[PDB]
Every structure is written in C-alpha cells, then in structure tokens.
C-alpha cells in the first residue's frame, strides 16, 4: 500500500513543524560533551537550560526514503564553548544530509572517521551539504536561537557513541570576543 503524500507547515521563525515528534535536550542530557566540566556541572545545578529542541517527521528505515527535521539550537556557552547539538556519524556511514539554515547565526563542525575536521558557517539561507562519512554537529555562535531544517535518508540512522566518547577533534569557543575554531585538548 502506497503511503499518503502530505504537506506540513514549517514556521521559519520558530522552527515548529506541524505534526512532528518533539525531542528536548537539556544540558543535563549532555554529560561528557563539553570541555569545561566545572562550568557544565555548575550550569546544570543552577538552571539546567534546554540546549536544543528537535521537531522530526520520520519514516520507517527504508532505502531511498527521506526524513526531515528542524532544530532550534538555543544560545549559550559552557565556559568558553558555544552551545551545540550532540553530533553524530550516520549508522549507515555513507549517508549524506542537507541542512538549510533558517534563523540566527551558527555553523557546522564536521569530521571524518579519522578526525580531520571542517567548519562551515551558516546564516539564514545557507544550505550545507554533509557528505557521506562525515560526522556533523551544529553550533550556535550568536545571541538568539539558531534554527535550521535538515533532510536525511530514512535509513541513515545514528552513531552518537563515537562522539560521546571522544568528541570532535576541534571545539568552537569565544576568545577575545571572537568565535574561534581550535584544537580539542580532550582530543
């Protein structure tokens, strides 16, 4: 039986998708992700801010099918490091992804299985091509929510563990009022 085509309204200003399933990620949800563990623990104890919310419209995991989701990445810092999504490689490593930036100031940090990293700045209208094999994490580098839409293969899946254990080979921090992409000491 064929699946039904549908249209859903995406609000470019809030990232809310009609009919999507919501995911809420708080700072407490990201232990071991930020370099400055003291600032993390302190921020989690004081207020445990929401780091990002995701609104996903996903299909069964099937070759050739497509999922899509917006993310609203909140502004903030853990010590010097800007708020980011957990990041992942795809379970089917060779699956690509396309991101479309809708609101705010941010960027994407990507790395290969071997650790070689890339940084792609994102502003409203920027479309980012995430090639096969690249792990990817988005970072909010501004003062307002950073909102984007992502379209990804239905069978791409997720390898979060690799990133949770070793993180990214680079980190994105604020140094002298400037955004800088630098080596991860933890790496």
Note whether 182 binds a second copy by CB under 8 A: no
Going by the DSSP 8-state scheme, the letter that residue 84 receives in this structure is: B
Q: How far apart are CA 74 and CA 77, in angstroms?
A: 10
- State the binding site for Fe cation: 88, 90, 97, 136
**Which of 65, 166, 180, 183 is the binder for a second copy (CB under 8 A)?**
65
Q: Minimum distance from CB of 48 to a second copy (Å)?
A: 32
Q: Which stretch binds a second copy (CB under 8 A): 23-31, 78-86, 96-104, 168-176?
A: 96-104
Task: Convert residues 94-133 into a mask of x (bound to Ni ion by CB under 5 A) and - (unbound).
Answer: ---x------------------------------------
**Which of 100, 164, 179, 181 is the binder for a second copy (CB under 8 A)?**
100
Among candidate residues 32, 159, 170, 155, the one with its CA nearest the CA of residue 111: 170
Residue 27's SS3 state is helix
Q: CA distances (Å), 123 to each of 9, 47, 103, 148, in order?
A: 21, 29, 7, 9
Say if residues 89 and 82 touch (Cβ distance below 8 Å). no
Residue 162's SS3 state is helix
User: Quick one: residue 38, left, alpha or beta (phi over 0 = left, psi -120 to 50 = alpha)?
Assistant: alpha
Phi, psi values for residue 117, rounded to 5°: -110, 155
Note whether 181 binds a second copy by CB under 8 A: no
Instruction: Write out the two tokens for 42.
Output: 């302190």
Q: Which stretch binds a second copy (CB under 8 A): 32-40, 74-82, 122-130, 178-186?
A: 122-130
Closer CB to Ni ion, residue 95 or residue 103? 95
Note whether 15 binds a second copy by CB under 8 A: no
List of residues contacting a second copy (CB under 8 A): 2-12, 17, 57, 59, 62-66, 68, 92, 94-98, 100, 108, 110, 112, 116, 118, 120-122, 125-134, 136, 149, 151-156
């Amino acid at each position: 039986m064929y699946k039904e085509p549908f249209g859903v309204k995406v609000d470019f200003e809030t990232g809310i998708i009609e009919g999507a399933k919501k995911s809420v990620r708080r700072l407490s949800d990201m232990e071991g992700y930020f370099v400055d563990e003291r600032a993390w623990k302190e921020l989690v104890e004081k207020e445990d801010p929401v780091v990002y919310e995701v609104y996903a419209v996903e299909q069964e995991e099937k070759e050739g099918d497509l999922n899509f989701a917006t993310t609203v990445l909140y502004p903030g810092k853990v010590g010097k490091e800007f708020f980011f999504t957990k990041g992942h490689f795809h379970a089917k490593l060779d699956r690509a992804e396309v991101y479309v930036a809708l609101k705010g100031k941010g960027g994407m940090l990507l790395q290969t299985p071997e650790g070689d990293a890339k940084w792609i700045s994102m502003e409203p209208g920027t479309v980012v091509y995430v090639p096969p094999y690249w792990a990817h994490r988005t970072v909010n580098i501004g003062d307002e929510p950073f909102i984007f839409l992502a379209i990804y293969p239905a069978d791409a899946g997720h390898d979060y563990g690799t990133i949770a254990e070793k993180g990214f080979s680079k980190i994105v921090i604020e140094e002298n009022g400037e955004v800088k992409v630098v080596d991860n000491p933890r790496w």
